[PDB]
Write a protein that holds these residues in place. Structure first.
Motif, PDB file in Angstrom:
ATOM      1  N   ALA A 199      37.914  42.295  58.142  1.00 54.82           N
ATOM      2  CA  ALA A 199      38.469  41.056  57.580  1.00 54.82           C
ATOM      3  C   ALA A 199      39.192  40.342  58.709  1.00 54.82           C
ATOM      4  N   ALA A 200      39.141  39.012  58.672  1.00 52.19           N
ATOM      5  CA  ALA A 200      39.889  38.185  59.615  1.00 52.19           C
ATOM      6  C   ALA A 200      40.591  37.079  58.837  1.00 52.19           C
ATOM      7  N   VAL A 201      41.829  36.776  59.216  1.00 49.67           N
ATOM      8  CA  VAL A 201      42.599  35.774  58.494  1.00 49.67           C
ATOM      9  C   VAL A 201      43.232  34.803  59.466  1.00 49.67           C
ATOM     10  N   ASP A 202      43.452  33.572  58.955  1.00 49.84           N
ATOM     11  CA  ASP A 202      44.304  32.566  59.597  1.00 49.84           C
ATOM     12  C   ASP A 202      45.278  32.107  58.531  1.00 49.84           C
ATOM     13  N   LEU A 203      46.539  32.474  58.690  1.00 49.84           N
ATOM     14  CA  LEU A 203      47.548  32.252  57.631  1.00 49.84           C
ATOM     15  C   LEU A 203      47.996  30.818  57.534  1.00 49.84           C
ATOM     16  N   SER A 204      47.803  30.045  58.589  1.00 51.81           N
ATOM     17  CA  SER A 204      48.044  28.623  58.583  1.00 51.81           C
ATOM     18  C   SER A 204      46.740  27.842  58.536  1.00 51.81           C
ATOM     19  N   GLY A 205      45.634  28.483  58.194  1.00 46.12           N
ATOM     20  CA  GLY A 205      44.386  27.732  58.091  1.00 46.12           C
ATOM     21  C   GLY A 205      44.269  27.109  56.719  1.00 46.12           C
ATOM     22  N   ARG A 206      43.398  26.095  56.559  1.00 47.11           N
ATOM     23  CA  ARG A 206      43.160  25.511  55.225  1.00 47.11           C
ATOM     24  C   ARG A 206      42.730  26.641  54.255  1.00 47.11           C
ATOM     25  N   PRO A 207      42.930  26.506  52.946  1.00 50.70           N
ATOM     26  CA  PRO A 207      42.382  27.514  51.996  1.00 50.70           C
ATOM     27  C   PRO A 207      40.866  27.629  52.124  1.00 50.70           C
ATOM     28  N   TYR A 208      40.363  28.846  52.398  1.00 47.58           N
ATOM     29  CA  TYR A 208      38.913  28.971  52.595  1.00 47.58           C
ATOM     30  C   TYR A 208      38.572  30.448  52.558  1.00 47.58           C
ATOM     31  N   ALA A 209      37.487  30.798  51.901  1.00 53.28           N
ATOM     32  CA  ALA A 209      37.076  32.208  51.878  1.00 53.28           C
ATOM     33  C   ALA A 209      35.608  32.287  52.180  1.00 53.28           C
ATOM     34  N   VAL A 210      35.221  33.245  53.029  1.00 52.64           N
ATOM     35  CA  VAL A 210      33.808  33.499  53.316  1.00 52.64           C
ATOM     36  C   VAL A 210      33.619  34.998  53.185  1.00 52.64           C
ATOM     37  N   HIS A 211      32.619  35.406  52.403  1.00 50.35           N
ATOM     38  CA  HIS A 211      32.377  36.820  52.108  1.00 50.35           C
ATOM     39  C   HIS A 211      30.920  37.102  52.411  1.00 50.35           C
ATOM     40  N   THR A 212      30.632  38.004  53.385  1.00 47.18           N
ATOM     41  CA  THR A 212      29.247  38.185  53.802  1.00 47.18           C
ATOM     42  C   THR A 212      28.970  39.671  54.007  1.00 47.18           C
ATOM     43  N   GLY A 213      27.664  40.024  53.918  1.00 45.59           N
ATOM     44  CA  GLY A 213      27.202  41.372  54.241  1.00 45.59           C
ATOM     45  C   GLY A 213      27.240  42.376  53.116  1.00 45.59           C
ATOM     46  N   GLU A 214      27.895  42.079  51.993  1.00 46.50           N
ATOM     47  CA  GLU A 214      27.961  43.102  50.944  1.00 46.50           C
ATOM     48  C   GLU A 214      26.549  43.366  50.414  1.00 46.50           C
ATOM     49  N   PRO A 215      26.090  44.620  50.343  1.00 46.76           N
ATOM     50  CA  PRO A 215      24.710  44.861  49.871  1.00 46.76           C
ATOM     51  C   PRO A 215      24.435  44.287  48.492  1.00 46.76           C
ATOM     52  N   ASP A 216      23.170  43.952  48.254  1.00 46.10           N
ATOM     53  CA  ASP A 216      22.822  43.265  47.007  1.00 46.10           C
ATOM     54  C   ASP A 216      23.113  44.097  45.763  1.00 46.10           C
ATOM     55  N   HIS A 217      23.097  45.440  45.858  1.00 43.86           N
ATOM     56  CA  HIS A 217      23.299  46.212  44.618  1.00 43.86           C
ATOM     57  C   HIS A 217      24.734  46.040  44.102  1.00 43.86           C
ATOM     58  N   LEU A 218      25.665  45.569  44.948  1.00 42.77           N
ATOM     59  CA  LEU A 218      27.036  45.373  44.450  1.00 42.77           C
ATOM     60  C   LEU A 218      27.154  44.152  43.531  1.00 42.77           C
ATOM     61  N   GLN A 219      26.114  43.298  43.462  1.00 41.41           N
ATOM     62  CA  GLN A 219      26.115  42.180  42.506  1.00 41.41           C
ATOM     63  C   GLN A 219      25.959  42.627  41.075  1.00 41.41           C
ATOM     64  N   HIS A 220      25.565  43.891  40.842  1.00 36.72           N
ATOM     65  CA  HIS A 220      25.375  44.356  39.468  1.00 36.72           C
ATOM     66  C   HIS A 220      25.798  45.810  39.308  1.00 36.72           C
ATOM     67  N   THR A 221      26.671  46.291  40.190  1.00 41.27           N
ATOM     68  CA  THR A 221      27.191  47.636  40.097  1.00 41.27           C
ATOM     69  C   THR A 221      28.459  47.686  39.258  1.00 41.27           C
ATOM     70  N   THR A 222      28.613  48.801  38.551  1.00 44.74           N
ATOM     71  CA  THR A 222      29.830  49.062  37.769  1.00 44.74           C
ATOM     72  C   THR A 222      30.416  50.378  38.246  1.00 44.74           C
ATOM     73  N   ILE A 223      31.726  50.380  38.490  1.00 45.36           N
ATOM     74  CA  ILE A 223      32.491  51.590  38.785  1.00 45.36           C
ATOM     75  C   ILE A 223      33.227  51.903  37.499  1.00 45.36           C
ATOM     76  N   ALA A 224      32.860  53.010  36.853  1.00 42.85           N
ATOM     77  CA  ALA A 224      33.284  53.316  35.477  1.00 42.85           C
ATOM     78  C   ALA A 224      33.943  54.687  35.424  1.00 42.85           C
ATOM     79  N   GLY A 225      35.088  54.759  34.789  1.00 46.77           N
ATOM     80  CA  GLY A 225      35.741  56.031  34.523  1.00 46.77           C
ATOM     81  C   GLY A 225      36.041  56.129  33.043  1.00 46.77           C
TER      82      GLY A 225
END
Ligand SMILES: [Cl-]
Ligand SMILES: [Cl-]
Ligand SMILES: [Mn+2]
Ligand SMILES: [Mn+2]
Ligand SMILES: [Mn+2]
Ligand SMILES: [Mn+2]
Ligand SMILES: [Mn+2]
Ligand SMILES: [Mn+2]
Ligand SMILES: [Mn+2]
Ligand SMILES: [Mn+2]
Ligand SMILES: [Mn+2]
Ligand SMILES: [Mn+2]
Ligand SMILES: [Mn+2]
Ligand SMILES: [Mn+2]
Lengths: 191, 191, 191, 191, 191, 191
Positions: free
Chosen positions: F105-131
């Motif tokens: 993760a990289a941050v700029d605390l005085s940067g404009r509000p902005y989020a970029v999220h990349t590289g997460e494998p496709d199976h995490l779009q429909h995965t459930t962590i269940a207990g």
């Protein structure tokens, strides 16, 4: 008079270069890496320099550090011998056929430090030229030309148009660099 | 005090490691494999460890067993010197440019034992770095990092972002591991 | 004095070559193959040789044997006139633009016998240049340069960078060979 | 004290640099190229240098020569201020997110002169950032980093991981170089 | 004496060229298009011509007509100064490395009028080099070389072997043309 | 003092956040979503915040609204605790290896509000962590980081370089965000 003596002592090697740009090919090279000695002897001779190179380094590890330190010192000697570069051709280039290989080099002696190396076949990235003494990994060719250009502060472009044998490919490049330098350092009768 | 002395005698080799995590780069390595000595000297020095490594092994076969046993013993020494790991940064990472090469390493010192090695060009699977003494087969780089991680019981991820020269590629990785470890073992002033 | 007279009589042809490397372009060529006469006249003239070529052969079959025997004899004459090759530039190269065509030749006069011919468009493998007399099949261009290199015992690399017209493509190659030879045979004032 | 004053007068430009590595971000840049002034002001400020740059050059042609001469002089000033480089972190790197852009730079201050620039989107090879005064052609970004690395004699690797806006992409790179330098020049308390 | 003065007045521009082929690089160019002035100054200087160019034209539309009329007049001046072309080398070529760029030009001064321009990267078809005055659209490079060749009545082949920066790519071509011309116009001591 | 207490009551949830940026990892999180509690506890602890989070929401529908409202409130608390941001490092980044996973993760605390999220494998779009209690749909990870960045008004770039296990992939991201924030909020001794 366009001469330079460079001594370079590092933790890895001890180098002495004596260079005369206006020589007759009187060349003696002893780095502990005999195929490199052969290449730098061809370079000095075909450039019509007078060149002595005495290098000792950590060849128990491999030839890389000695090869690199020698090329740094040699590039430094070349740039120092060129002095103010006034009155010279500045640009030089040379084609070298060697059996099936054709190589080429082009230089700008007053150009910013820059090296571009293209066309060398992919097998030279992992080829070894081995005899009875310290071997030479042809992947270092690019490094030699980069170090020369960086420390002489010249633009040096080396190309392999085609070829197969790694010794022909390598030797033709060193000779092409040599004859490009020879042309570029010559007095220009119109400048 | 975060020191460890490991002796490891196997049929193939005899190893003594003395390690101090809080050192000043006082490093002496002698394994019979001079390019490996160079790599482990860079690792100890750039990690700001004090490190002595004395290894003798069956280098008539090749360096593999000596290289592997040394890395096992070194990983063991690292894990033992870390002790309870209280109060340390735990995480560390480092980029190392080396001419055309860029490498990176990231560590978690309290993570499960795990090693991931990615990006090294394919020619390093069959490259040899050879000098006047026992040569080093770069295919072993991955094995060294695995053995270190397995025996220090840490997560170690080593990446080559790009590069060409096998000595630059290898040395940049060992230095990246070194500087990642250096950051991770440091006292954390907020834990 | 760098002159040679070669007579070559075979079952297929009778050839006499008189060559002077230090000439002024005094050239007379008569082989019975007028487009070949034109090519060898351009070669002798642009090389600044003095060259006479008198060939008669079995052109009822086709020009091949006469063309080949002439090039063998000419290569022999070149190698004999070069003598010990002392004091010469040795390396030479030349680009020749001819309307849309660009050709290039590079030579090493002290290199092993070797010829490499690249870039000629595929239609020249089956093109005929035909006038009122014996025609010329451009597929023979490669053969001419091979025979010259083999018998002069030189390295000769001929390239067509690009082009379309078969007469331009062919003539530009012969002229490039000519001007490469001219440069390479010249006294080198520093050797 | 780690300060340098460089004056560089060429036919194309006149440059004065005053640099202090141990500054507080007191920066004043005036090159005649206002977007470049903005970039070098961000570089000096984010590196926590004190930096003044006064450049005048042939901006009637375009900003290239002024931009290049300034970067040469600045790289020279950086290398001269670093002196013997003893006791410093040597290695430094920094990620810079800027809205949609992420850039990164890594440096080795004692590495051979070398620059590698990767990932910048292709449209930056022909983009212009234009205001009311001399414009800035983003194709020059690579040249700036090369000239800095060549003349400071450092290894500088600059990467654009991703991005779209040419001003974000450019500014994020200059800031990443800045913060990598800032980390690398700092005293290292363990060396 | 190989000199020419050309005046060319059209609806779009007014041009005066004074050219001496046997000069020492005394060059003064003022067309209202400063990057073009820079290119033609490099051409005159690297060709070792003496060259003055004074052009005024309709740069409110863009530089094209002025650039084209100037190149027409310059080509005319070159052809007129060459006179009967007796005794000259006729052929000339030159490689020019400029940082990452390598360009080449080859000429035949007695060849039919013909220009071939190859290898320039596609982004130069829509690149602008812009400063504080009239800008230069690099798509015109090809047009300049065509107009020169057409009006000097020479064969001119210009190649970009590789490169990235549009100013390097352009300037290296003009210099290559310059040094090819310089070689070709020289007296040939054997003709 | 860099503390904030945020209460946020909506139709879907009731949230109380107490945050101290200058803490020692004293963290207590209870949202009704135990895997999210685990993630936010890792975030607070690895950021060396002191953090209490008490959330109750409409988890009969699913955790989304509670997860989102909590991240909004937490981002608000972070931005409010940062105050004027004077004197801080501003930029921060962190690599986190977790077995086979590597995140960053990289941050700029005085940067404009902005989020970029990349590289997460496709199976995490429909995965459930269940207990044994309310489950966690990993598709929400991106939403959490967006909501944090939007309401803290910071630039936050989160990358998964590689990985397989969804719990490792998720936890490594939250820890990377945590350690990037920790670095960025620290006093900068030179600003
Ligand atoms: Cl070529
Ligand atoms: Cl990365
Ligand atoms: Mn090296
Ligand atoms: Mn040889
Ligand atoms: Mn093994
Ligand atoms: Mn090394
Ligand atoms: Mn035959
Ligand atoms: Mn013809
Ligand atoms: Mn430039
Ligand atoms: Mn800006
Ligand atoms: Mn036009
Ligand atoms: Mn220029
Ligand atoms: Mn939502
Ligand atoms: Mn967990």
């Amino acid at each position: 008079s366009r001469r330079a003596r460079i001594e370079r002592r590092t933790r890895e090697s001890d180098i002495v270069i004596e260079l005369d740009l206006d020589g007759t090919g009187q060349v003696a090279v002893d780095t502990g890496v005999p195929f490199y000695d052969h290449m730098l002897t061809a370079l000095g001779s075909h450039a019509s320099f007078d060149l002595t190179v005495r290098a000792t380094g950590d060849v128990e590890i491999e030839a890389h550090h000695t090869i690199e330190d020698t090329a740094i010192a040699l590039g430094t000697a070349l740039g120092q011998a060129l002095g103010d570069k006034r009155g010279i051709r500045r640009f030089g280039d040379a084609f070298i056929p060697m059996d099936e290989t054709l190589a080429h080099a082009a230089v700008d002696l007053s150009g910013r430090p820059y090296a571009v190396h293209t066309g060398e076949p992919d097998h030279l990235q992992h080829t070894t030229i081995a005899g009875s003494s310290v071997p030479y990994h042809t992947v270092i060719n690019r490094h030699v030309f980069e170090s020369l250009a960086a420390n002489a502060r010249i633009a040096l472009h080396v190309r392999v148009l085609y070829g197969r044998d790694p010794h022909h490919i390598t030797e033709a490049q060193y000779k092409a660099v040599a004859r490009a330098l020879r042309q570029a350092v010559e007095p220009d009768p119109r400048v």
